Amino acid sequence: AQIGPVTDLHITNANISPDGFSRPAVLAGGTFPGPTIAGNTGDNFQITVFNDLTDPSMLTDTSIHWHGLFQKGTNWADGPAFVTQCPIITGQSFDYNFNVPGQAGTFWYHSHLSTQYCDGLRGPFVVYDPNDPNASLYDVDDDTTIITLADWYHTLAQQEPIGAAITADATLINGLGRSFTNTTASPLSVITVQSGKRYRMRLVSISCDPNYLFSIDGHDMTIIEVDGVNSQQLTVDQIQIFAAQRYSFVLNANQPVGNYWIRAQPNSGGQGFDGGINSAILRYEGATVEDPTTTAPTTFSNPLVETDLHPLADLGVPGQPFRGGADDPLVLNLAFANGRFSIDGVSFVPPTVPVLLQILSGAQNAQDLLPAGSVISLPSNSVIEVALPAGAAGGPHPFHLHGHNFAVVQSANNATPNYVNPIWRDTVSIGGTGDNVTIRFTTNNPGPWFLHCHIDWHLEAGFAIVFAEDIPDTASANPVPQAWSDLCPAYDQAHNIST
Ligand SMILES: *[C@@H]1O[C@H](CO)[C@@H](O[C@@H]2O[C@H](CO)[C@@H](O[C@@H]3O[C@H](CO)[C@@H](O)[C@H](O)[C@@H]3O)[C@H](O)[C@H]2NC(C)=O)[C@H](O)[C@H]1NC(C)=O
Ligand SMILES: *[C@@H]1O[C@H](CO)[C@@H](O[C@@H]2O[C@H](CO)[C@@H](O[C@@H]3O[C@H](CO)[C@@H](O)[C@H](O)[C@@H]3O)[C@H](O)[C@H]2NC(C)=O)[C@H](O)[C@H]1NC(C)=O
Ligand SMILES: [Cu+2]
Ligand SMILES: [Cu+2]
Ligand SMILES: [Cu+2]
Ligand code: NA
């Protein structure tokens, strides 16, 4: 069952064996992935998070981010540790009380402390639209049509060297899959469809690192949503999905009744499908209960290309139709050396006092904010452009902005910008050497918004900056509840920190 929009959510430690190998984890709702949190557009969500963690090897503090939800007027509820709050300590709870006006689509939630989400704290978050403009394109859209793609590690995250090329041990599809080494024939996930019906498959990357080449043997996929943004229909036979991205696609159950492989090939870790790695099963009602015998093509004739996507609504692009054609045009220098990432010459290391609390305590320019050099102010009611030229090791890097979605004016692997009708999204691959992926948005949401690579190992190694959007209006726009004001005193007392 789905939970929400008003619900408790307990965060616990438990052993799990999603690929046959037992290890302890950090779980929401007792499962991997966590339960789906759901509601309708404009609803009030109140997710009271109970931190019941006791195993220090995965951290006993926690904080949860609602990925892709704008949090307008509720910056304090966004979740990134030391940006919008101090962590919740064990044996305490915290009500994330916010609203979702003007958003409907496929999202997710995850820990936003250190690399803790890699240890298991990740689940789907779906905001349905009772008047969805795509409703007539499908028959079925429910918890059974969510497809999660996850990387899974046998080593605990706090034992992964900072700045290293860290590699997974299994791909999990809906929580199940097989290990790349010492492979055992552990259970595969099954997605069941009825011949003749059309399904809104909500594809969610909950990855900590790899991108996946996702396909379904014998089937194609008609994209209708990108990171929460309704799209024009785009039919593809393969989707390369980067960490934290989401797509809705229509699956037409129009092939013969049978069993078909579902494939998710990561860019690192195990290559291919030997022993049923990187796989799940699409089963038609009435099919024999047996593994598929289908094969992939040698090459995919209609892969997703990001410049082919266009919004369903007339969203346009803010600003003027040329590079630098914005009120505040930025170019970030994105680099890696010696195990650490940097942005504009500064490697991100979380501050002792969360950025939001520094601003509410009176610090009002970005040079007064800590970490020094890691906070850039943005002016209010302005068009912002951010060029993100690639080249830093460990690519392709999927960059994500909190508090906002953005027009993708220039995409990976294509030097031509689009000032007319590019897709809008919230996480974007910045591509390869010589690319100049560029995003635009308008500043109508006061507060500190994290910008970072969504390969969690890279964020841990410093690949982040904070956009302090409209510092002067942050306090009036974001009144804070007493329970939020209590978080840093409690956390600092528990950890013997002075501030
Ligand atoms: C990606 O696109 C951005 C624009 O969106 C390009 O930024 C431009 O970068 C050049 C230098 O590479 C800038 O010109 C330089 O300016 C300094 C003075 O600030 C001057 O001293 C240098 O001689 C040179 O003129 C230009 O200002 C800038 N545009 C903006 C908005 O900052 C960037 O080069 C592109 N990157 C790649 C890898 O294609
Ligand atoms: C590289 O990225 C550029 C920019 O996003 C892509 O260019 C766009 O290509 C589309 C599709 O062909 C062009 O739209 C076409 O416009 C014509 C004339 O209106 C229309 O009759 C066609 O039906 C279609 O709508 C679009 O104008 C063009 N934009 C720009 C700024 O050049 C390009 O396709 C991408 N390259 C690859 C290999 O995908
Ligand atoms: Cu995220
Ligand atoms: Cu986010
Ligand atoms: Cu990265
Ligand atoms: Na425009």
Tell whether 410 and 479 lie within a shared domain.
yes
The whole domain housing 400 covers 314-499
Give every strand in the sheet of 105-111, ordered side by side.
37-40, 122-128, 105-111, 64-67
Which ligand 1 atom is the nearest neighbour of the CA of 389? 38
Measured torsion, CA atoms of residues 323, 325, 330, 335, in degrees rounded to the nearest 10: -10
Give resolution in angstroms. Answer: 1.4
Tell whether 168 and 110 lie within a shared domain.
no
Residues with CB under 6 Å of ligand 2 are 305, 307, 414, 416, 418
Instruction: Give catalytic residue positions.
Output: 65, 67, 110, 112, 397, 400, 402, 452-455, 458, 463
Tell whether 390 and 487 lie within a shared domain.
yes
Tell whether 65 and 201 lie within a shared domain.
no
Tell whether 485 and 372 lie within a shared domain.
yes
Structure tokens that stand for 279 in this block: 């796989």
Tell whether 218 and 287 lie within a shared domain.
yes
Experimental technique:
X-ray
Listed residues 313, 339, 361: the one ending a domain: 313
Tell whether 499 and 362 lie within a shared domain.
yes
Which ligand 2 atom is the nearest neighbour of the CA of 417? 4
Domain holding 441: CATH number?
Answer: 2.60.40.420
Which residues are annotated as part of the binding site for Cu(2+)? 65, 67, 110, 112, 397, 400, 402, 452-454, 458
Tell whether 48 and 87 lie within a shared domain.
yes
Residue 263 to residue 217: CA distance in whole angstroms? 8
Which ligand 2 atom is the nearest neighbour of the CA of 307? 5
Tell whether 139 and 124 lie within a shared domain.
no
Return the HEC string of the chain: CCECCEEEEEEEEEEECCCCCCEEEEEECCECCCCCEEEECCCEEEEEEEECCCCHHHCCCECEEEECCCCCCCHHHCCCECCCECCECCCCEEEEEEECCCCCEEEEEEECCCCHHHHCCEEEEEEECCCCCCHHHCCECCHHHEEEEEEECCCCHHHCCCCCCCCCCEEEECCECCECCCCCCCCCCEEEECCCCEEEEEEEECCCCCCEEEEECCCCEEEEEECCEEEEEEEECEEEECCCCEEEEEEECCCCCCEEEEEEEECCCCCCCHHHCCEEEEEECCCCCCCCCCCCCCCCCCECCHHHCCECCCCCCCCCCCCCCCCEEEECCEEEECCEEEECCECCCCCCCCHHHHHHCCCCCHHHCCCCCCEEEECCCCEEEEECCCCCCCCCCEEEECCCCEEEEECCCCCCCCCCCCCEECEEECCCCCCCCEEEEECCCCEEEEEEECCHHHHHCCCEEEEEECHHHHHHHCCCCHHHHCHHHHHHHHHCCCC
Cα(331) to ligand 6 centroid in Å equals: 20
Tell whether 301 and 341 lie within a shared domain.
no
Q: From 307, 408, 411, 435, give the residue whose CB has the most ligand 2 atoms within 8 Å, as the site to mutate.
A: 307
Give strand pairing partners of 105. 127
Q: From 323, 409, 418, give the residue whose CB has the most ligand 1 atoms within 8 Å, as the site to mutate.
A: 323
> Counting Cβ atoms within 10 Å, is residue 314 exposed (0-12), middle (13-18) or buried (19+)?
exposed
Cα(68) to ligand 2 centroid in Å equals: 28
Cα(131) to ligand 3 centroid in Å equals: 27
Listed residues 296, 313, 330: the one ending a domain: 313
- The total number of structural domains that make up the chain: 3
Ligand nearest to the CA of 392: 5
Cα(296) to ligand 4 centroid in Å equals: 33
